[PDB]
């Protein structure tokens, strides 16, 4: 007849006898090295812990007191990690850069929430007195995703009667805090201390039968400022290659006009910016408005309500304006040009219509409808670039009140040339293995594949060389040919052409190339790793 | 050469010959006999149904007519289930409490939507005439997740030659309805009837080769009111232990000032509350406002617009106010205190700025911008706690119009001390196996692990003892040592300290402990379950 | 003692030696169909392509210039695909209708995002001058989900020594564009060209050991307009049967009063509609308003603010109305009836409260609070139905300004009788296998099971015959008994009764029945498929 596979019953296999346990450890804190950077060390050695995985680092955030504006960057927990390294008596087993750990967890909304993504943390709070509480104390949790979590117990790190050391290097606190001038960052930085604790799932296993494993170790290279090339040397067995860009704000004071806070949509960034500009853009004054630079060009709105700024027509109509007063428009709030009587980037020209009602009670304008063409790039321009030496105009024609509200943003994990990484600034990408073109593209097809294959909406241009199921199989890799000089991956990009009279032209770019090398994990006489060659 | 595993082709195995079928059954309804609670009984007896799984219970909701405010709780279908039991001739095979079924499906957005989560059902509707329709008839669907759905046909319940009985126990209709005093709940409760139907996926199988299986049966223990301990006895082979708290509103009339309806975000709860208070908070009156208790302290807003309530400064500026009228501020709308010389919890002090415009056409204030520090706890205070014997003040200084709009909320599945379970009220947790400490924590590390391992945002403090793949392996369990007295799990919490002058300090709490025991399923003389023991 | 399976270690198997590669191809464009329909042709054959899967089609959308309102339908990429077929020398291997491909990807948010779902694309933009840019050029990506992606390399299509041809048939551009009369669609349609490119993951495999496979091929039948029956013939081995309805707008000009754009919630549809009606519903005029048809009944709002339209009372109160002017209410904005002095469907009766403030500066009413009972069906009524011959009334008593803003919507993938498919129009469903009733239901239990089993919130009434794991097992199917005449699936529905004096009654319906037949894939003398019988 016919031999059939039973799809209604199963012979329940008896597994290895084990007992899991959640373990938490306090570490050893050290302020040694460059600018006395914080390093936490956690030593795991126990006769009963046979294997482990699922590392979670918790951080105690202090009470923030005083005057000024202060808020934490979104996912504050991931952003204060600089480097993570797992090692034994035989040396490093696995290690990752903070930004690469963050990139691996970006598709895990739970891990991101736990690390600190809330109104309480991420909104920009204000202290009114020196004894006022800006932020209340809080605990954040950072999931340190490792290759040991992939297939739970099967993929766990076995401790071959060895001592495992987890070392966490922290970023300066300046990187995770959004603040204004008024805030006393100097004494905050002096008083701040990283208070960490490491948790992991430990397994007490009876009669383990250890076998060798394979692990992928991410390695990254950052190019020279504004160079559209980068190279990864000694590439012998890679499972994937990822490419992205980062802005470099070293030529600026890292001050930006606005920040949306906990609301992180592209619309939220734009709305926060427009709201800051509208304070100085439309003025209801008796005579001509006062307290603006001499270079400012504030014009009385005509009876038809249209103000012409060259080619741009701005329609301004404000209701209930008192008889003794008039409506004025700032026609050059933020200006940029590299040549006199030539092209100009004027933010006031990005407004089509402004409508509202004047409040006799609060003596201010309440804006109803605003038609504009402000984008995520405009909100991402550092205030330094508006007032650069290249600019023939004064640039920043805002009030001193507005300039005082500007924020310092030093988020370490920004990509592209805008806060949302919306703008694609790569026109073409070429990857070479030796001198042979391995891959090229004129569109982000590699990012599209990344997002589809990993079911993430925050992908990067990625080349995958391994489609083989993890843990149960030895991974598939791009393999070197040293004799033919094929022992390196060279990435070359063509950046999209930008307007010289737009301030973003002057945001410095850095090309980031991430390579995942294959390693063999051997548990013969303690845990050891070997680079596949 | 190298022996290689084919990763590009597979030998497609021929499975068991079977035919699936969706089956629907009407039951037998019974209101016998404690508080005359509704019980629906469904008998599956067919010579051709070899196995089954994926139980879906449907409920016909009636047309709600009359006057008053009425709405259904979110996920109405799950909230009306008290208990579910599956039985054989040999007894119960599997059973679960309503709240535990809900907790297992809480991360299934599809199952939750199907159960009743819409603007049509969950918004608080109002009836203006006795013949007015408040709610239209509707059907909701409840996915009764069982261990038999885990691996589809492999995990299905085999009927063999036995008769399967599914029994559903329902909660009072009072638990699933949000209403005001105006609504005639008395005749609604009299006339309401649960109209259920059970659906399941049945499999007609040719030449079944049945083998024994393992099943996890959740068992829960609720502690005494305000007891920070609970114990699960006869723990011999458990796969997990879960711990959470529930509020107990028995010391209250279950009335709350506001409810957001279908909009269930923390911001939605806060916005609904602020909106209710603003009606009495800022008044545009000719002379001093009337219709408030003598204990109300309503003050005329000065020319600078700032009203000082002790340390708190409230900025009130209303545009287009008529010349014959003035702007007033209610400085003690809600106020709590246990001494006449102590700290006062005043809700009017939680406001920094209130701005708007008076409408000459509709004779009302239209609020534009409001700066406040109202949180989810404030929206979760029962009105009874504001007017408790512990409070030396009158407490509720609102108008009779506002007090008439208060809602009765009896949702059976609330956790913590707020409607969103945002506030973590446990400071420490200790789990003991016998008298030996098995696990302790001073932070919700076990909840963080629960949320990460189950990829969920609605976790609980959970200890998992099983990391082994389900169905294909016998589960891993915490095992008893009866001689050493290690055959019980004792949970002890330490609740976080709250200010005695905050009304939320008087919310009664109950500790819930859920334990998943391992059972062996045998199909010799029909279906039978055996508790795994030494 | 006891035999235990190792749950902590695995012998990492060495897989087949292969190298993946992302390949992109330009096709051959052809306008050779009935109405000169666009066909793209892609030919795949190579030494180093042994297998392939994960088909992604990219489309270059042009810059849209000129005057008028224009926007793209949501998920424009999927909506422009009419049919897809994969074939070899031996004929077709797999093929799908555009709507069925879309239905399979509807639960993949990433795939839907990539296909064109943004405010930039889907919001209705306006061109003010003939040289004005309405839409900027853009690239969208369409994931052509095939049975070959299910289990990655294991399920991949092997090419053998065969040439694979991927044929894409496109819908008219008319189907993917939302526009008004002002827009010059005539020259847009003339100038528009589909610019496609096919990408796939190709595998260079060393020493392939090919084995036969099984594939499910979806096949659909569309019933006659308004016929509550449809039959699928030659059903021998089906894995599932799906049933849904579609509106037919052939009896209309495909014009609708409003469209929400990027915002696609039921509330967004209703809000966009109310906003369009309010322009003509409440008028602030000196004397009786002008520029409305003689059939319009515009009434001055009394001192109490209540206007009675038969049984319906509408409360209207507008602030800051000038002394020389009064507030008017349009009591029959849109009205329908099949007889004089009988039942009437009047849109003005669906309002109970309208409040706002008149703006002296912009000479318009700014509405604050609106109480109404407008639903998703009202927003889904084609304007043709309001002004049909069946209507004894004029029907559309709006202003010429409002009528000029009406939009053409030809979205090919609409289900039910409303844009959100909210309203269930099927009261009963009966499925017959031969002349024997296989399944019947009076509620959408089969849709509930579909949504639960496939973890989707956009399911259909579906009968699943296969619960067996894919690729590793031969699928389970409903099997024919040709001698007993049991080789066909007949579907019969009962539609819910609709009011003859409601315009939606006149929306025509079509029954869609989808059947997934089982086929064997064999690789002897090239790639070839055989229907299981």
Residue numbers in the entry:
A (entry chain C), C (entry chain A): 15 to 547
B (entry chain B): 15 to 548
Question: What are the paper's exact sentences on this?
Answer:
The structure of native wild-type D13 was solved from the phases provided by the isomorphous SAD structure of D13D513G, and refined to 2.8 Å with R/Rfree = 0.177/0.206. Crystals for native and SeMet forms of both proteins were isomorphous and belonged to space group P6122, with one trimer in the crystallographic asymmetric unit. The N-terminal hexahistidine tag is disordered in both structures. V1 and V2 jelly-rolls alternate around the molecular 3-fold axis, lending a pseudo-hexagonal symmetry to the lower part of the trimer. The trimerization interface is completed by the N-terminal tail of each subunit (residues 15–31) that extends 43 Å from the V1 jelly-roll and wraps underneath the neighboring subunits locking the base of the trimer together. The triangular cage formed by the turret domains presents a negatively charged outer surface at the top of the trimer, whereas the N-terminal subunit tails form a positively charged surface at the base of the trimer close to the negatively charged membrane. D13D513G and wild-type D13 trimers differ only in the additional short N-terminal helix (residues 2–10) visualized in the structure of D13D513G.
Trimeric capsomers of the VACV D13 protein form a transitory, stabilizing lattice on the surface of the initial spherical immature virus particle. The D13 lattice seems to act as a mechanical scaffold for the growing crescent membrane of the IV with sufficient rigidity to maintain a constant radius of curvature of the crescents even before they close to form complete spheres (Chlanda et al., 2009; Heuser, 2005), thereby fixing the size of the immature virion.
